[PDB]
């Protein structure tokens, strides 16, 4: 991003940490739910409790 | 599944015949008498016999032309085997020690702390690290890798021959000798893209300074230590400093395409390497002229692949979908023809 | 006794540039002072109807 | 009979004004990567070894192995290039900055042009230029060779004003002739890879030896045939002032060291001298007997 | 550059020319190394210094 | 015993001289082929120019460049390997006559050299590997006709006039036939009879058998060159390699909202989240065999 | 390229008339100069002329004597061409009798300048010198123009006599007891460290040894005293960085049967010197060593 | 005296089988030293064999081989060999006796042979209890590491228990240069290594008392600020901090 400092427009790179930070443009809402059904399949929880 | 997707690019080298045609008296060749210089190793005297030739051309247009006639066989493996970046960038290591020990053991690459002058040289430069493997039953092998958005459209982007970069960069469209306007069309995301008019089909490669640009633009790659022996199929798309400099009036372009557009690739070793420049046959690469790449047959699942192998002659070209899974039909029927025709 | 029958040699075949049909494209001209000449240029003046 | 030469040809066309620029270098060294007979201009000269990240030591290390060659006679469409033989005198043009007196031992070095422009540009040709190695007296090479190594050791310390000034002093050599400042290897706040590897080659030899040599000197000093290793045990201490009334009576020695790693440290001490060897010993390539007036041509007996 | 106008005065041979897609384009897309096109009647042909 | 070596040395010298002369001839052949391979644009380029010659009366407009680029890209994928995909005789004949019709005429053409017996006149030569011409002799046996071409028998020469020595020295430039220009300028005549490069060479002509093809009133020479590359250590310049970069997605995510399903009558995937999200991708080897990239 | 052309024997220049004669035969003009035969046409020796001021000619009129350049500071007298003998006054090896003997012979401001420029510099002696070869054909005037050999044999013009290298007897040394059939001559400066100044001791060490490593190994034998004194000065003085303790440079070779004593005779002053007779010069370079 | 000869004729005394004179015809243009350098040499003085001793030391050979006059064999025949003494700076072909392959532009070195181990060449030219040993010509890097291995064997030998020395020498002798393996023939600690121990420890200790305060500190300064693969292993050899 481009934060605004004391009359400057200094750029600010910053780590994304979790996979959820990716914009809902690049990791849509249904995508994460489909991915979570993958993980509950991997744990043998396909019908969840 | 982690959040991102991959869009591997992979060049494949075909042995082939050409047929040339040339007009009568198409170029005169002035020659002078051969002259014989002499040398002596005192065990034996070599003599050398030079001759001079100059070829004035005698045609205003092109008096000659060429066509690729016959593909005999494929040199390249056409396997997948994605390229090991741990050997392309040997110097880089994680700051923490234990984490890099663990990562090397997980990815399968490790270095032994012998400080062999070969290891010192390799980490310093070149050294052709790979040393080919036990029994090569297919041939030369490589693939490349572009971290990408899963939302990427394919029906508009992967079914047809197109640019892996995510933003079309055919300098043939751009006004000749126009660097201020050639740098927008390949880089700027406010100005609307070529083939598809969406700004950028993949942001993480099409931006200037994106991860894939800084990863494969050799101008960026040099600032980091990297092995130059290894040939990277993707770099021709991302060497933007050169392709910006390539846009020139049509005929300078098609003269450039005959002279530099070639990309030497070492032919005896297992993996592709940059040949000793121009010692061998230079390999022509038509995809370099258009800066595009051809889709090959791909399926998400085996079920869609079985239907292809079970299907008719035209089966490989048709693309299909199934709620999530897809098949990207090939543009060129080489999997039908070079293989089955034999 | 172990017999050595005839010894044999490869008989070479010579080829000539002008004998070749590819010389149909070239218009070869000897020029004994060729090393001196820097470059040769031909100039064309065509008016357009 | 004809003298043996090496013909060279220019893929790109030459101008009448361009070929006149070669007649100027008709008597100048032109290094070649490899002895061959016909050579394109691309393989000619030192320009093929230019790099962006790689620095002065890359050029020096490849320049040691290239085949030295004088230009002999421009032909218009061709160029001869005689390969000098050891022990026969050849004239050379004075590309080096410094004037040569008779008897000087010359040696070849990469070009070291500094920032402000002077006469440099001659033969631009198709995005290509004929860079030529400096020919310089032996002592000036011994001095330049160290100026760069010290600016490399200071490359890590540009925050300090004292180092900031001392670097400037090393930067401008003062020689018995017009002076020529030396370009700073440091750039963009960060040292180039070649000087970094060479400084590691020096500092490994400076540090790995100090902890290692005591395990051997303590054992050799017992014999006494040489009679100086006992004096050398005190030399190991690396103290500058006379010893305090405290710890030092014997040099520090490694403890308990696991049986095999001592071989690996030993061999890594010797691996670093090999990286350093390209800079350790400069070698003469010419020995000038007489010099032309204006110190422009010289006639040097070839060495190597 | 290249001296023209020697060319408009030195008797030239005259030869049936052939360029695909006319002459103006292949002079305009830089097929040929050097070229110059003038529209009226440049009197340089008449100046002889 | 000594005379044997005295004669063997002489024979080794003669062998080392004859083989070097022959290597010189083969190198001249090789270099003249290397020259054409650098001045020979690919087929689709010449064809696009030969199809769009009319419209571009000026330096081409912003739009015409796009039409030309589109035609380049189309011709490339439909002409990449010809004897590999098609072998229709009427189509291969049309393509080969199209190759000759696409090549522009040379500046100077001497009627006397390279004239087939019985009034025929040659226009050019086409060269390829042996296995290609062996296919062509089969496909076009009707048109190919061996004939006795009247090739030139000796190199020409380009001798300097006495006047040229002065202009070479004072001005570093040489115009051919300076003495003819002095006469035509003094007499005021505009045209020159011949422009000196047709003036030099090929006065003596010798027959040689060749194969020729009719390409619609064109008579192209057909010539294989593998003869000169037998047992040599140099790779044939006509044998080449062609790289093609390919690219494939792996692990995408097709939209759930605007989702759809063509073929489904064919396959039936087991209901599983593993069948739902693609994580792998499948391809095939050089020989057809399933391949995987996880 | 004809079969006979390679078969021809190589043609020696004497078989062909001189190039000047090849022109005069064509154009027939006859100068006063006798170009029928060229002198100095057979000389593998390479040579160079050095102007040396008349204050340094003494003991060099005899052909055969090292020429060594000496750089000193001042831009006006950029260099100065010392003999080996003139350098002996500074050496500690030389006998005090020989030193006081020959020191009288150099009573000239041009030579005394050499002692002053030797004293002047803190930096070591071996740095300032560069051997040039050997004297021959003294021009012997108000200012001698000495001809000096860079490589090859010393000998007369017309090869009527072979000049011999002369080395003052106090500098000459031999390590070995059984001389080889051939042996190389090396010049060896060796600093022995001392408080006010590190005084040099010059030597010339003929030996059949050629390998550098074995040569320096045998050299440290006699020079253990100077080497240990260098090590002792290294620890005695902090922030003092004294460098190499001897320096060896290959000076040429002689057949080791030629070696025998003699004396130079000048101003009625006999000077005992060893005399390598057919001493071919092949210069090397100073090689630092501890 | 008579100056050193350029052409030197070697004469064998023992009866030469028609098979063995053929080995020398294939041995032409090899690098064969002589100590003597007369015009008509005996065969006894050919090659390295005369310096084999009961000591069975490799460094004795490395040391005595340095003094010998290298000659290039030439114009071999029955009853005669014609060794040539090369002149400095002049070109010569050199036959590749050893298995090591020679890269273009590499420099060469002369060291006594290092047998492969399990196998040896049959065509030794042994005759009359006189074998024809000749020095190997190797590329410079291999000749460097063979000596580095020998010197490390000499330095480690002292101050270590004799059983530990066996384990070290068992591996320091094998060399994998250019994918071939090689083994030093009976490397033995001796006086010939002892004087080199003294000179190496002396020069390497006087090095420790010449590096400036910053010259030694440069690595510490570098690692605390920047890191790379080269620096990882150098952090290891630095023992602790």
Author numbering:
A (entry chain C): 540 to 588
B (entry chain C): 1029 to 1370
C (entry chain C): 50 to 98
D (entry chain r): 3 to 306
E (entry chain A): 1 to 49
F (entry chain C): 148 to 441
G (entry chain p): 1 to 290
H (entry chain q): 1 to 241
Original authors' sentences:
One icosahedral asymmetric unit of the capsid consists of six types of heterotrimeric triplexes—Ta, Tb, Tc, Td, Te, and Tf—located at geographically different local 3-fold positions. Tf and its corresponding pp150s are smeared out by the local 3-fold averaging due to the icosahedral symmetry imposed during previous reconstructions. Using sub-particle classification, we released the 3-fold symmetry and obtained a reconstruction of the asymmetry structure of Tf at 3.6 Å resolution. Like other triplexes, Tf contains one copy of Tri1 protein and two conformers of Tri2 proteins. After this symmetry relaxation, a tRNA-like density along with the underlying three asymmetric pp150s emerged. However, this density is weaker than the tRNA density on Ta. A slight change in position of pp150nt-c on Ta and Tf, which alters only the flexible interactions between the CCA tail and pp150, dramatically reduces tRNA binding or increases the flexibility of tRNA.
